[PDB]
Amino acid sequence: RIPLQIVRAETELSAEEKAFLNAVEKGDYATVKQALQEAE
Amino acid sequence: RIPLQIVRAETELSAEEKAFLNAVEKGDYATVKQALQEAEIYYNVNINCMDPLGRSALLIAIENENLEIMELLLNHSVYVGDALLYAIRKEVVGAVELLLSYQFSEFTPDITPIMLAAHTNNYEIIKLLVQKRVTIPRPHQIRCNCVECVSSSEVDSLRHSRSRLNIYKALASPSLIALSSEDPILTAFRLGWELKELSKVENEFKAEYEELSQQCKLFAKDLLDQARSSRELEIILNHRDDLAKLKVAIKYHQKEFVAQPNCQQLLATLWYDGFPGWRRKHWVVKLLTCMTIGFLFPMLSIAYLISPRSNLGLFIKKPFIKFICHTASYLTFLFMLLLASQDLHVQGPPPTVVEWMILPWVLGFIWGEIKEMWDGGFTEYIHDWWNLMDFAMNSLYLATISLKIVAYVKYNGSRPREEWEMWHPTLIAEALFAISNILSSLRLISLFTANSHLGPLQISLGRMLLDILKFLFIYCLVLLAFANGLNQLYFYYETRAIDEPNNCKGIRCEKQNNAFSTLFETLQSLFWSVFGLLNLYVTNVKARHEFTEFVGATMFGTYNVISLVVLLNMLIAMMNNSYQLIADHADIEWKFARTKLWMSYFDEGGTLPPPFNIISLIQNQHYQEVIRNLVKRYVAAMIRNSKTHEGLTEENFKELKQDISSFRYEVLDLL
Ligand SMILES: CC(C)CCC[C@@H](C)[C@H]1CC[C@H]2[C@@H]3CC=C4C[C@@H](OC(=O)CCC(=O)O)CC[C@]4(C)[C@H]3CC[C@]12C
Numbered sequence: 001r002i003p004l005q006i007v008r009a010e011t012e013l014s015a016e017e018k019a020f021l022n023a024v025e026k027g028d029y030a031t032v033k034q035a036l037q038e039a040e
Numbered sequence: 041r042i043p044l045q046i047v048r049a050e051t052e053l054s055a056e057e058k059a060f061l062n063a064v065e066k067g068d069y070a071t072v073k074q075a076l077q078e079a080e081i082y083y084n085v086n087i088n089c090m091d092p093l094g095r096s097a098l099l100i101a102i103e104n105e106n107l108e109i110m111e112l113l114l115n116h117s118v119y120v121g122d123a124l125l126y127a128i129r130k131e132v133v134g135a136v137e138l139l140l141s142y143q144f145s146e147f148t149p150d151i152t153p154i155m156l157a158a159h160t161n162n163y164e165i166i167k168l169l170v171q172k173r174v175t176i177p178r179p180h181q182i183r184c185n186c187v188e189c190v191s192s193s194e195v196d197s198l199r200h201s202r203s204r205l206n207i208y209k210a211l212a213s214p215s216l217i218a219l220s221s222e223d224p225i226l227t228a229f230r231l232g233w234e235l236k237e238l239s240k241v242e243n244e245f246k247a248e249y250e251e252l253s254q255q256c257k258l259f260a261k262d263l264l265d266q267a268r269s270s271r272e273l274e275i276i277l278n279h280r281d282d283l284a285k286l287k288v289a290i291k292y293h294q295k296e297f298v299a300q301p302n303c304q305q306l307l308a309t310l311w312y313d314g315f316p317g318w319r320r321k322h323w324v325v326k327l328l329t330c331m332t333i334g335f336l337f338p339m340l341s342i343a344y345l346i347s348p349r350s351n352l353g354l355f356i357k358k359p360f361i362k363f364i365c366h367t368a369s370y371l372t373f374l375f376m377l378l379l380a381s382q383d384l385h386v387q388g389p390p391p392t393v394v395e396w397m398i399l400p401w402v403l404g405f406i407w408g409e410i411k412e413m414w415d416g417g418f419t420e421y422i423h424d425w426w427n428l429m430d431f432a433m434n435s436l437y438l439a440t441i442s443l444k445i446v447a448y449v450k451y452n453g454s455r456p457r458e459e460w461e462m463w464h465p466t467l468i469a470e471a472l473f474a475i476s477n478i479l480s481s482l483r484l485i486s487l488f489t490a491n492s493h494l495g496p497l498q499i500s501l502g503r504m505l506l507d508i509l510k511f512l513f514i515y516c517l518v519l520l521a522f523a524n525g526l527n528q529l530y531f532y533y534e535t536r537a538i539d540e541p542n543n544c545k546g547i548r549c550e551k552q553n554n555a556f557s558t559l560f561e562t563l564q565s566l567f568w569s570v571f572g573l574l575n576l577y578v579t580n581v582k583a584r585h586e587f588t589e590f591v592g593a594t595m596f597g598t599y600n601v602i603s604l605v606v607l608l609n610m611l612i613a614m615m616n617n618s619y620q621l622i623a624d625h626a627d628i629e630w631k632f633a634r635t636k637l638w639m640s641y642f643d644e645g646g647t648l649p650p651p652f653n654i655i656s657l658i659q660n661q662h663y664q665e666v667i668r669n670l671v672k673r674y675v676a677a678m679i680r681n682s683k684t685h686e687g688l689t690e691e692n693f694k695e696l697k698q699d700i701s702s703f704r705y706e707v708l709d710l711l
Pocket residue numbers: 367371484487488490491492
């Protein structure tokens with residue numbers, strides 16, 4: 001068997017942070033604006 | 041009339057059930073949810089049922105990327121099996137993530153999600169699958185003979201071969217090498233070599249292993265292409281576990297990696313070490329500098345012999361100067377061989393002044409060949425394919441020397457050559473010397489590689505000689521056959537040499553005779569018939585056997601028609617077809633061959649041309665950083681190129697149609 005991993009590891013995103021980028025991808029202006037004013 | 045029916049009948053769907061699947065197809069969330077909550081109560085609609093075209097509701101939602109109906113069906117606990125693989129092949133990251141978070145199949149049973157992701161070559165999905173600890177089983181050896189492999193071959197050879205092919209297609213994924221690999225370049229090199237070997241072994245599955253090897257080579261080439269500075273280039277080329285990775289690439293025959301423009305530029309600026317501005321010079325001054333260095337090879341050689349630490353001693357250690365010195369020494373050797381042909385009745389004479397000069401270059405050539413043998417080894421020596429004729433030259437020179445010494449010791453007198461023996465040692469020695477002269481003078485074909493306008497031409501000759509070798513078998517079979525027939529007819533009328541007008545027998549006489557009397561002479565005659573040097577009256581006998589004459593003449597005519605009209609034009613057509621297949625990659629192959637010739641001069645061994653040759657974790661860490669930047673750049677570049685190529689099918693149109701229809705039922709519901 002060959003083990004598989006990430007030999008060049010990077011910094012993963014959190015759940016709310018992935019949700020923010022996914023909201024940017026689908027174009028929900030209300031969710032993106034709400035996330036921005038909540039992050040501020 | 042032909043009746044039509046369904047010979048392989050299946051289970052039809054009911055009206056409400058077809059309505060449910062049609063509502064799934066148009067994306068009416070309200071209707072689908074209402075049907076689900078009604079089925080939970082009444083048990084009238086089967087949620088896991090099939091369609092006329094092979095799919096179920098979850099499959100339709102996955103292929104239509106409608107994540108909200110897909111998660112509704114997941115929350116209602118529909119059948120799940122192989123829908124994960126369907127989302128993997130569909131390349132929908134939301135479907136993949138949701139099915140990871142939780143009969144008939146068009147996939148083989150060996151298909152694992154990591155393997156199907158590696159087939160799809162989608163970096164995102166492969167990385168999300170690699171985030172979980174997931175394993176691919178190791179393929180065995182190419183020629184493994186263990187009990188498990190022989191049992192799997194005997195039980196079901198189709199599934200065994202499909203499984204091995206499936207494993208190797210999974211492993212040859214550029215994304216799966218970009219991740220999960222300590223050294224992607226070396227991994228691609230070894231994988232390409234292994235896929236080439238499996239292509240050679242598995243005859244039936246040849247093209248797919250060839251294209252996988254080509255894909256690995258292209259991945260390595262593009263990974264080298266993504267470099268953006270000369271330091272990163274030299275860290276890649278100088279990594280070892282100089283130019284260690286370049287030598288590995290040459291060993292694994294990665295012509296695409298070797299023929300990279302940046303690698304060729306670095307090799308060029310190592311090759312022109314002494315001259316920094318050879319790239320921008322005129323033809324006349326280049327020729328003048330080349331002749332100026334070439335006329336000073338003994339001065340540079342004796343400078344190296346006397347004092348290596350000087351302006352002239354280390355001047356020959358530069359690669360271009362070393363190449364010019366070797367070429368000039370070898371050309372002077374050929375000039376002396378030409379001079380050697382310019383009393384002749386002495387039996388076993390002493391060597392003349394020209395042969396006394398030739399002898400140290402002969403010794404130096406033999407010493408250089410055996411030194412290359414002892415230094416490089418065995419496989420590297422036999423792999424070159426020029427060392428075969430080099431060995432032939434050395435053997436013929438040694439035989440000439442031995443026969444000359446034997447003749448000089450055994451014979452003393454001065455007898456004219458008209459009454460010498462036919463197997464005289466002097467005659468044998470001179471024949472061998474002339475053959476070695478021809479071999480020495482055609483050894484110069486190897487120097488066409490270093491030239492810009494002759495290298496691809498030499499590559500084209502080396503690729504069409506294979507088809508000439510293929511044609512030679514058929515031609516020699518025809519030659520042997522017609523020689524046998526003509527012998528069987530004509531060997532009754534063999535005449536002695538005395539009966540001839542000038543006591544000459546054979547096709548090399550003024551009047552050609554006995555062309556088909558013996559098998560050797562028949563082979564010679566039917567060989568010389570190709571070039572027209574065999575006259576027509578060699579098919580004649582002294583007796584009046586006109587039928588015998590006519591059958592012999594039509595045998596000769598049939599041989600001429602088969603050879604000159606059919607076979608020769610076949611050879612012309614074959615090489616013309618073969619040349620077009622080589623003209624595309626001739627540049628890459630020439631650059632690879634010229635790189636090999638350049639690296640042959642980078643070593644300190646073999647510096648002196650004949651006859652003068654007889655007289656450390658920071659490297660790993662820097663390499664890892666450079667490869668990490670290369671992998672990031674390559675993934676970005678192949679994502680951009682995936683978003684620049686055609687890539688679009690009717691999947692996209694039905695995706696937009698699904699979005700429009702789902703929205704349509706949404707606003708018809710809200711209003
Ligand atoms: C074939 C006719 C003209 C009779 C002459 C025979 C030889 C005297 C010729 C034939 C092949 C020639 C060679 C063909 C190609 C080259 C490469 C050439 O190098 C380059 O192309 C320069 C650029 C570089 O090396 O980077 C140097 C001369 C040399 C060895 C030539 C030297 C002279 C040779 C041996």
